[PDB]
């Protein structure tokens, strides 16, 4: 018979959960995110699609801070990401109030981990519709994940999700092959803003914004910041010149 | 979120069939032979180790349970529906009996309390009924020796000797040539052992059958001497031993 | 009355087949891993497949400490072995708090097995894809290996192997233990016996390991670790002289 | 024992003319022997051309005063901007007193 | 979501039927037939055993006949299992009222009360109903002796005569027919018997198959008593009667 | 099945459009608002001749200043009058002052989509939308004389005139061609009586039609038989002349 | 096809939509058009009302949320008020609490939550209405659009409900001409009205049609209706 | 403290030094001027590299180090080794929301490899104060001149097991709630070492 | 937990429970009331399915709510029982905070109230059952009857008969009962109500029941003989002709 992609929970004659794979469409639907890992820290960065001119340039803030020092940027339904982050505030100010100490990302990770995999347990609910990078420094280095609607989570070196994740992660390897050293926090932003505007090309037909952020031991201090000011136009001027 | 099964999952058919008992019934006859014959000085319930590989170590793995010192228990059907039957049933044994009375329970009694917890199972929102049907036999001073029998549905009723699972229908019909009113315990483990044979497909000893008795009082495995009202309990597992002592006198 | 085959209620020939459909998805991963015993120790390995290059090696591991002396091993999705990672790790502080001693992996085993019972019996609830093999030197028993699954069957081995590929490990040990006759490696250090494991894996599955394709973790008295990419080399090197 | 109430002080004085109306209140708040402020405000203007005070325990004052500004606030949301009568905002003063009862706002209150 | 699910056990079908209720009442004509006749002088209950055999015990046995109060007896037709859920609310609800009034309690308040649970099941909450119907024998101060019967809609009647179970239409059909309102026990003893003989789908009519009880109040003593009768005793009636 | 908040692919909701069908079935209500008083009007509908008329409520006080009609599954209405009622009568305590009609309508109005199974965002315990719409005329100082015509879908609409019921869409056509700025109470009385005897099935009489006016002075009065059949006399006269 | 992915919000189609959100969407576009636009000392918003008949009155379509901030809605409008009711409380709390005005940004970022806890669990069902939220915090003017999926835009101007595509070419149009009217209330609105005006077909916007509503530097959100939007026809 | 339970009196204290920080305390615990248990353990080990001191109710402490003990056990199986500030802040939590029922007050000192030695110690109240060495029970009182006196940072083993042992044996002279023997725990990279002295050693010197 | 709208309306504006509850009470035994100057009299027919019943103690068809009202229906027998045990409770409730006991109109309301709630709360079926509510309002002394049906809808009747053949009988009394000179007299009110009931029970004594209630708290239930008497001179102003 048929109707095992009816309900969330149920599983399958050959073992998958069908809703959380149409999840994973909503999330192929989304804009470009993507991570890199570096040196010292991370940096996240997105592609903002410009529905038109009515919007306000640099108002629509798509990237979230977690205590001070996560960042979490995510493809697909933006709103379920926002409920996402609302859940991981939570859980690491409670983790703070108990032990005192910001949230390791490794904890962090599988807080949001067994929250997102919650919502693959029951009819009841439906699974999150994105996929998150995130990550930060905390007191053993920089770690960067990435989070898919199943709950599967593992640690990155660079990550990708959204249409363009396949030039992304094309170029994301590119660069973990170049550069075994690491990466400098100003070249991965600079590498950052090149890998979404050659992944804008997988939605060429709209003009877009771009969004970094990153947090680093060194240039930001361990804290999540955003990429603003002139540290973003050198970033798009590098992009806009590796692209021809 | 939330347990929003409040309804049964169990409901009347039109021919008056109570499917999900009848299907449960179905996976007990798929189970492992497991009987129990009742003497005049004891009872044994047994049933065979169908061990699913030979790397697991047969032993961890108990089908012949102690519910109380007095009464123990056997099944056929799903292992672990049984496991946490028994659970449940040592805990009530406590919690309906022992914490008011001061004295585990009678083995109606306690019989009577696994088929109230099977029979919500059939009515209760948002569960399936037990997939097991159970054997249990005791002793307690005022009734005697008993041996019942438990199904999917909640309904027990007691019995001389029985046989639920597999080969069942031949077994009981072993069964009911071989018993009379006047064997002794040695006798009913003896025709406990030639029923199993014949439901037993592979190897039969010591090592892939379990049995256990429900006797004489076994001070050995009190633990403890020095109170004089609490003689030991009645039941008792038979070692590997002890089974293949008993089925060199085939 | 056909939606049967959706929640855990019976079919007309008594199956559950949510559970059976839970039991292929712990096939998902394509790992396969094995549990042995030694004197004084008991060791799991499992195949370790990291295929994108931009994954973090270091992150990506099945086995689990659950205790300072339990250790679990999971074939299946990495979500639901969380899952029952964390439930477990919480049970057994809970033990340890209320009962004065440290959780038995076997009574962890029985635990985890009763929770997944539920899952077959309640609607409601979805089982977990996924087996556990939980292993640890316990302080009454000695090694052990107890492997739970989505029916919620449990029992302990004298060794065990689950994945994909889980009957020629088993066969394979299967054969090594009607030819020695005992029910462990005789072998008195962790290091023989891990390489035993090693040993018949690649024996068994006809394939050849460098030390970023293996995982593994050893139980040995009031300790469970996993081993570092380096020290498992080490066994890798030591093996490569008796073949 | 903790105790929940305090005495801050102060008198004030409402008298009512023809066509006109004031509330007035001295500007000194206490506690004991010792001056807290010379010059805290304890008569408001609370919209709808009502004037209120509520003097005694000055945290219990300073609640009320903010929840019947509140309570005038929701009654433009919830009745289409009407203005509230004075004897209306006395009426529904007299349940927010009272909604304290076996607690009470330790203050006099006049508007 | 889970509506999916629902039987809906509670709903009126386009005739204004219970559909459940009907369906549990199917269930209920596969039962034994339950027989209860009422005399001038005492109550009789008679009873076929359903699912038998040689090895059964019957000494230690009860399915069909239970004891509610020294003075209320019931006969089951239907799922034993159901049966004993109701049967001990039953028990307790006549302790309650021996508590508070220091009275036995009156048949009927006992029937009614039992019935109230029935009727529940069939409004509310989306449980599948009792698949047992009862016959009810009783004594007390203001009625003497009572006979009433409750099936899963939870309505309830009373009766000189009455069957449940299997072939009711065939053995009401006998008892109207040899039923004198003028009789005795032992007399109502011999009915109950005859016509289960003549009703029973099985050869012949033995000891073993049945269960048999009576509500008399002994002209020599005071109190009324109930005698569930036992195996010998069965056998006993059941050759003076002409059964053999 | 399919649930009971669900959208239909145009964008409405199932329950409330299925729930204004079964106010398609009911008796016909007409309210007629002018300067002097709200008049409310209502065809009784007895389903047979031994029914005593008069225990027919489809007219019912909600204050002194506010009454209302109704039009549909009528025992539906009963816990809705209870909450105007239980409305106007707390505004009165809370504020010693009359509920302003527009306040009371949107009160009555809050009750109607909270029907649901567990919809998230708040609780909501009704297994369904109303089966009933309601006319609710009233005065007030600030707003004056006003009709209000509220529905299961929470939406009211204020209207000069307005009927609801089997025979409206007639019966809004007659209004919206009679009504005028300037009637009297006593011409509204008798255009509410003249559109019902139109659409009505039966023979319009003092029996099977009631009518009711709200004004500044008297408040809500339901006018008993007497008092209509007069007024019912008064339009045989005036239409029978040209 | 169909039936089978859009009886709850909890199910997720084939390709990965949402239906009973996309058809909460489609209230929208059947309700009566209203825009918004803003330059950087006041925003407005403008509004054609919609009646039933011709004997009664004009739905409202703007309502105050506190002082400084306020909504056009579009769609079912009972649950406008459910959500104006959520701002006007959230509104409140800031104010009571920490002494301090609910920034527009915030406001929005309050309301997509709002509305995704409507579309991630069963039983429930999506808003069905559209909100247009206009207002004056520390930051300046406001102007943001919100959709039942939640998803919340911060914007120039725009305009939803039916037809709202013809006022939305007129704003991304006059854009930089209305970026600039800082300091003349009049003519913001003036530009909003000749916006709304676009969206037209039916009739021309009367006295008893038009709705607007402005806030900004000096002036508290204020809602003008019927007699005093006659000079702006 | 309740009328009637075992109270802990006691004379403890954690000092820190070059290599780590070493613990110690009295063993004595009273009901009244009965010396229910002379030969108690204060030294209480939460994990293997942190260990408190307590004083205060018997019942309590052990109660609340009981739960500690439970949450880094969990802590551990999760995130890795604990600070001695998270195993502080754990304390803290307990003792500060549950003011009111407790009479806890508990000296928590650690070693790390990272941080080295640390003591912090939560008084009556709840509050938690990290500081270079920190004294407590009943028999501080009389040690306070003493302990600011010849207290110096970082201090020798040898030095420091010398000061705990002068300090505790002046508390144990004048207050009579303390008494037994001195238990001592050394917490270094080295490990964790028990060290006791009996009366006779420390009464004359 | 359970509370699925099993009550909903359907395409058509409908509410299947609702009506297929009033489908469960056109099966029901046959109700009638009619009120004459001073007095309400209620007639219901005896379910013949089966017979061999004891009259002492079998549940009647007509209960006493308070010792001035009564109430009968026709519907599933079990759902009765709820209604009537609340409606006793409310009028003992009533007694207690108003001193004074309910009006019949009143009762009416009530019952009718709980029969709409279950029309439109989560987990339950409407009652199967309709109901004929008779008496006299306290010190008053003009007769009452009302009917209340499943959807909760409630009015008064001259005379009025639910349950199987209704409608047969309904027309009977349509064309026989005169509000110029209702019965005038117990016995007369009687006579008509057997009249009505004869004309759907087919030739039955012990068929019919019929419960007479008067002013201040006199209610009496006829015996089976005096009935009879009646059927037999009903059967004479029918053979003479
Ligand atoms: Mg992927
Ligand atoms: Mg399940
Ligand atoms: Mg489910
Ligand atoms: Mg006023
Ligand atoms: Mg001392």
Same mark, same amino acid.
């Given at each position: ?11 399958? !004659? ?64 933006? !709103? ?46 439906? !699974? ?51 550069? !075994? ?64 | ?179 009379? =009113? ?33 006797? =004489? ?34 | ?243 | 024992? #903790? ?30 022997? +010792?001056?807290? +402020? ?14 209120? +005070?509520?003097?005694? #325990? ?12 509140? +309570? ?40 | ?96 009222? *021996? ?91 011999? *009915? ?53 | ?12 909701? $199932? ?18 608002? /002018? ?54 009568? /707390? ?13 009371? &309508? ?48 929470? /939406? $009211? ?57 709200? &004004?500044?002075?008297?408040? $809500? ?6 008092? /209509? ?14 | ?6 009886? %709850? ?166 854009? %930089? ?30 006295? %008893? ?15 003008? %209706? ?8 | ?205 | ?6 009550? @909903? ?47 002492? @103690? ?74 004929? @509510? ?27 008969? @639910? ?79």
């Amino acid at each position: 018979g048929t109707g095992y992609d009816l309900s969330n929970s149920v599983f399958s !004659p050959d073992g998958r959960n069908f809703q959380v794979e149409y999840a994973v469409k909503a999330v192929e639907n989304g804009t470009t995110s993507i991570g890199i890992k570096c040196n010292d820290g991370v940096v996240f960065a997105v592609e903002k699609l410009i529905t038109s001119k009515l919007l306000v340039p640099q108002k629509n803030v798509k990237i979230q801070v977690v205590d001070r020092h996560i960042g979490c940027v995510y493809s697909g339904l933006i !709103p379920d990401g926002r409920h996402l982050v609302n859940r991981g505030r939570e859980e690491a100010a409670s983790f703070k109030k108990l032990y005192k100490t910001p949230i390791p990302i490794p904890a962090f990770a599988d807080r949001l981990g067994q929250y997102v995999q919650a919502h693959t347990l029951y009819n009841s609910v439906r !699974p999150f519709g994105v996929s998150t990078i995130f990550g930060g420094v905390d007191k053993n280095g920089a770690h960067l994940y990435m989070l898919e609607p199943s709950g599967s989570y593992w640690g990155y070196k660079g990550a990708a999700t959204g249409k363009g994740r396949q030039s992304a992660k094309a170029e994301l390897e590119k660069l973990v092959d170049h550069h !075994p050293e690491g990466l400098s926090a100003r070249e991965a932003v600079k590498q950052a803003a090149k890998i979404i505007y050659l992944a804008h090309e997988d939605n060429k037909e709209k003009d877009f914004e771009l969004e970094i952020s990153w947090c680093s031991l060194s240039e930001t201090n361990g804290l999540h910041k955003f990429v603003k000011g002139d540290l973003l136009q050198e970033a798009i001027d590098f992009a806009q010149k590796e692209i021809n | 979120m939330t347990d929003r099964y409040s309804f049964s999952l169990t409901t009347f058919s039109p021919s008056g069939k109570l499917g999900q008992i009848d299907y449960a019934l179905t996976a007990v006859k798929q189970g492992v032979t497991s009987l129990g014959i009742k003497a005049t000085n004891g009872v044994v319930i047994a049933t065979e180790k169908k061990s699913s590989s030979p790397l697991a170590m047969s032993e961890t793995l108990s089908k012949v349970s102690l519910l109380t010192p007095d009464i123990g228990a056997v099944y056929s059907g799903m292992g672990p529906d049984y496991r946490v039957l028994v659970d449940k049933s040592r805990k009530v044994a406590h919690t309906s009996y022992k914490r008011i009375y001061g004295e585990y329970p009678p083995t109606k009694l306690l019989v009577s309390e696994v088929a109230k917890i099977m029979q919500e199972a059939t009515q209760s929102g948002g569960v399936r009924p037990f997939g097991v049907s159970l054997l249990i036999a005791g002793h307690d001073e005022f009734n005697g020796f008993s041996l019942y029998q438990v199904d999917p549905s909640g309904s027990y009723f007691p019995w001389k000797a029985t046989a639920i699972g597999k080969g069942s229908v031949a077994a009981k019909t072993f069964l009911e040539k071989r018993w009379n =009113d006047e064997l002794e315990l040695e006798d009913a483990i003896h025709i406990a052992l030639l029923t199993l044979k014949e439901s037993v497909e592979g190897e039969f000893n010591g090592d892939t059958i379990e049995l256990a008795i429900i006797g =004489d009082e076994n001070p050995d495995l009190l633990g403890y001497t020095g109170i004089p009202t609490d003689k030991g309990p009645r039941f008792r597992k038979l070692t590997s031993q002890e089974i293949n002592d008993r089925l060199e006198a085939l | 009355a056909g939606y049967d085959r959706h929640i855990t209620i019976f079919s007309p020939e008594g199956r559950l087949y949510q559970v059976e459909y839970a039991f292929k998805a712990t096939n998902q991963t394509n790992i396969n891993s094995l549990a042995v015993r030694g004197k004084d120790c008991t060791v799991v390995i499992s195949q370790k497949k990291v295929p994108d290059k931009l994954l973090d090696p270091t992150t990506v591991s099945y086995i689990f400490c659950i205790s300072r002396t339990i250790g679990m091993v999971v074939n299946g999705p990495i979500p639901d072995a969380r899952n029952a990672a964390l439930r477990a790790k919480a049970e057994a502080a809970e033990f340890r708090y209320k009962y004065g001693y440290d959780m038995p992996c076997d009574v962890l085993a029985k635990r985890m097995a009763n929770l997944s019972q539920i899952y077959t019996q309640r609607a409601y609830m979805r089982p977990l894809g996924v087996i556990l093999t939980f292993v640890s030197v316990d302080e009454e028993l000695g090694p052990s290996i107890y492997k739970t699954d989505p029916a919620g069957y449990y029992v302990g081995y004298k060794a065990t192997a689950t994945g994909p590929k889980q009957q020629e490990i088993t066969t394979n040990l299967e054969n090594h233990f009607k030819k020695s006759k005992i029910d462990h490696i005789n072998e008195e250090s962790w290091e023989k016996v891990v390489e035993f494991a090693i040993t018949h894996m690649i024996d068994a599955l006809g394939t050849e390991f460098s030390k970023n394709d293996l995982e593994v973790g050893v139980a040995t008295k009031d300790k469970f670790f996993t081993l570092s990419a380096e020290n498992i080399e080490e066994r890798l090197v030591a093996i490569a002289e008796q073949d | 024992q #903790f105790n929940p109430y305090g005495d801050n002080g102060g008198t004030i004085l409402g008298i009512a003319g023809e066509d006109f109306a004031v509330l007035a209140g001295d500007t000194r708040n206490i506690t004991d022997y +010792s001056i807290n +402020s010379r010059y805290e405000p304890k008569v408001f203007d609370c919209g709808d051309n009502i004037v209120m +005070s509520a003097n005694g #325990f000055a945290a219990d004052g300073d609640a009320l005063v903010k929840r019947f500004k509140n +309570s005038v606030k929701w009654y433009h949301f919830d009745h289409n901007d009407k203005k509230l009568s004075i004897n209306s905002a006395a009426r529904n003063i007299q349940h927010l007193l009272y909604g304290k009862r076996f607690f009470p706002y330790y203050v006099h209150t006049i508007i | 979501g889970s509506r999916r699910y629902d039987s809906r056990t509670t709903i009126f079908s386009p005739e204004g039927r219970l559909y459940q209720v009907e369906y549990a009442l199917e269930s209920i004509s596969h039962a034994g037939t339950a027989i209860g006749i009422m005399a001038s002088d005492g109550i009789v209950l008679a009873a076929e055993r359903k699912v038998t055999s040689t090895l059964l015990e019957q000494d230690t046995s009860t399915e069909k006949l239970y004891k509610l109060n020294d003075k209320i007896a019931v006969a089951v037709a239907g799922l034993t299992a159901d049966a004993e859920i109701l049967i001990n609310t039953a028990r307790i609800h006549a302790q309650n009222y *021996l508590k508070t009034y220091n009275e036995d309690i009156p048949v009927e308040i006992l029937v009614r009360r039992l019935s109230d649970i029935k009727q529940g099941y069939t409004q509310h909450g989306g449980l599948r109903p009792f698949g047992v119907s009862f016959i009810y024998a009783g004594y007390d101060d203001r009625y003497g002796y009572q006979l009433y019967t409750s099936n899963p809609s939870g309505n309830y009647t009373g009766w000189k005569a009455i069957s449940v179970g299997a072939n009711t239409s065939a053995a009401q059909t006998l008892l109207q027919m040899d039923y004198k309102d003028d009789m005795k026990v032992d007399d109502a003893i011999e *009915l109950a018997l005859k016509t289960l003989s003549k009703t029973t789908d099985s050869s012949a009519l033995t000891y073993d198959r049945l269960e048999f009880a009576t509500i008399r109040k002994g002209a020599n003593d005071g109190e009324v008593y109930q005698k569930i009768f036992k195996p010998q005793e069965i056998k006993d009636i059941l050759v003076k009667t002409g059964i053999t | 099945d399919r649930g009971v908040s669900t959208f239909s692919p145009e964008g409405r909701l $199932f329950q409330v459009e299925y729930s204004l069908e079964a106010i398609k079935l009911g008796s016909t209500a007409i309210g007629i608002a /002018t300067k002097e008083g709200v008049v409310l009007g209502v065809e009784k509908r007895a389903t047979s001749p031994l029914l005593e008329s008069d225990s027919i409520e489809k007219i019912v006080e909600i204050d002194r200043h506010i009454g209302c009609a109704m039009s549909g599954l009528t025992a539906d209405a009963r816990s809705m009058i209870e909450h105007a009622r239980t409305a106007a009568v /707390t505004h009165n305590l809370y504020y010693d002052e009359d509920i302003n009609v527009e306040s009371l &309508t949107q009160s009555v109005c809050d009750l109607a989509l909270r029907f649901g199974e567990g919809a998230s965002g708040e609780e909501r315990l009704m297994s369904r939308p109303f089966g009933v719409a309601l006319l609710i005329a009233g005065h007030d100082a600030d707003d004056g004389y006003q009709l209000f015509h509220a529905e299961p879908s929470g /939406t $009211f609409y204020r209207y000069n005139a307005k009927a609801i019921g089997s025979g409206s869409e007639g019966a809004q056509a007659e209004l919206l061609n009679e009504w005028h700025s300037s009637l009297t109470l006593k011409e509204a009385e008798l255009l509410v009586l003249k559109i019902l005897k139109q659409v009505m099935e039966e023979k319009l009489d003092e029996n099977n039609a009631q009518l009711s006016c709200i &004004t500044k002075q008297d408040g $809500f009065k339901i006018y008993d038989n007497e008092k /209509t059949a007069e007024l019912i006399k008064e339009l045989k006269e005036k239409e029978a002349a040209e | 096809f169909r039936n089978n992915y859009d009886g %709850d919000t909890v199910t997720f189609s084939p390709t990965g939509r949402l239906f009973q959100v996309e058809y909460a969407l489609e209230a929208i576009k059947q309700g009566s058009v209203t825009v918004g636009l803003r330059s950087n000392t006041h925003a407005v918003l403008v509004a054609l009302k919609r009646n039933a008949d011709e004997l009664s009155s004009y739905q409202k379509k703007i309502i105050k949320c506190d002082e400084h901030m306020g909504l056009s809605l579009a769609g079912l409008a009972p649950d406008a008020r459910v959500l104006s009711n959520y701002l006007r409380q959230q509104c409140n709390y800031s104010s009571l609490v920490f002494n301090r005005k609910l920034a527009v940004e915030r406001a929005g970022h309050l309301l997509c939550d709002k509305a995704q806890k409507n579309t991630q669990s069963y039983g429930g069902r999506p808003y069905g209405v559209g909100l247009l939220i206009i207002g004056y915090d520390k930051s300046g003017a406001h102007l943001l659009e919100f959709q039942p999926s939640g998803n919340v835009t911060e914007l120039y101007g725009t305009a939803i409900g039916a037809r709202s595509q013809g006022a939305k070419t007129y704003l991304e149009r006059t854009l %930089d001409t209305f970026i600039k009217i800082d300091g003349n209330p009049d003519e913001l609105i003036k530009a909003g009205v000749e916006a709304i005006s676009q969206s037209l077909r039916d009739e021309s916007l009367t006295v %008893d049609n038009l709705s607007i509503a402005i806030v900004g530097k000096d002036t508290p959100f204020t809602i003008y %209706d019927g007699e005093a939007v006659a000079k702006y026809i | 403290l309740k009328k009637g339970e075992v109270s802990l009196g006691a004379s403890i204290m954690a000092v820190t030094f070059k290599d780590g920080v070493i613990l110690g305390a009295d063993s004595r615990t009273t009901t009244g001027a009965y010396i229910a248990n002379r030969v108690t353990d204060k030294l209480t080990r939460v994990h293997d590299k942190i260990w408190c001191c307590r004083s205060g109710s018997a019942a309590d402490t052990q109660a609340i180090a009981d739960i500690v003990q439970y949450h880094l056990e969990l802590y551990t199986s999760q995130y890795g080794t604990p600070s001695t500030e998270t195993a502080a802040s754990v304390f803290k939590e307990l003792c500060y929301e549950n003011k009111d029922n407790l009479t806890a007050g508990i000296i928590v000192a650690g070693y790390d490899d990272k941080n080295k030695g640390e003591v912090y110690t939560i008084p009556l109240g709840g509050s938690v104060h990290k500081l270079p060495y920190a004294i407590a029970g009943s028999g501080s009182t009389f040690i306070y001149g003493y302990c600011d006196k010849n207290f110096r940072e970082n201090m020798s083993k040898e030095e420091t097991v010398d000061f705990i042992k002068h300090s505790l044996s002046q508390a144990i002279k004048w207050d009579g709630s303390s008494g037994g023997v001195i238990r001592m725990v050394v917490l270094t990279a080295a490990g964790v070492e028990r060290l006791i002295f009996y009366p006779d050693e420390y009464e004359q010197l | 937990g359970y509370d699925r709208a099993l009550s @909903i309306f359907s395409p058509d504006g409908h509410i299947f429970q609702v009506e297929y509850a009033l489908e469960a009470v056109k099966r029901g035994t046959c109700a009638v009331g009619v009120k004459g100057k001073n007095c309400v009299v209620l007639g219901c027919e005896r379910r013949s399915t089966l017979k061999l019943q004891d009259t002492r @103690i079998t549940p009647s068809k007509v209960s006493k709510i308070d010792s001035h009202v009564v109430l009968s229906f026709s519907g599933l027998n079990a759902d009765s029982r709820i209604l009537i045990e609340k409606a006793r409770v409310e009028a003992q409730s009533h007694r207690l905070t108003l001193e004074d006991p309910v009006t019949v109109e009143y009762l009416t309301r009530y019952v009718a109230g709980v029969q709409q709630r279950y029309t439109q709360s989560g987990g339950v079926r409407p009652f199967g059952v309709s109901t004929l @509510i008779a008496g006299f309002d306290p010190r008053d002394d003009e007769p009452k009857l009302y009917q209340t049906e499943p959807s909760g809808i409630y009015s008064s009747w001259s005379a009025q008969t @639910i349950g199987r053949n209704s409608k047969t009988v309904r027309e009977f009394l349509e064309k026989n009962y005169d509000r110029k000179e209702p019965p005038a007299t117990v016995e007369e009110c009687v006579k008509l109500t057997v009249r009505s009931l004869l004309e759907v029970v087919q030739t039955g004594a012990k068929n019919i029941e019929i419960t007479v209630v008067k002013p201040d708290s006199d209610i009496v239930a006829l015996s089976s003989e005096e009935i009879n008497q009646y059927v037999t001179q009903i059967e004479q102003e029918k053979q003479e002709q």
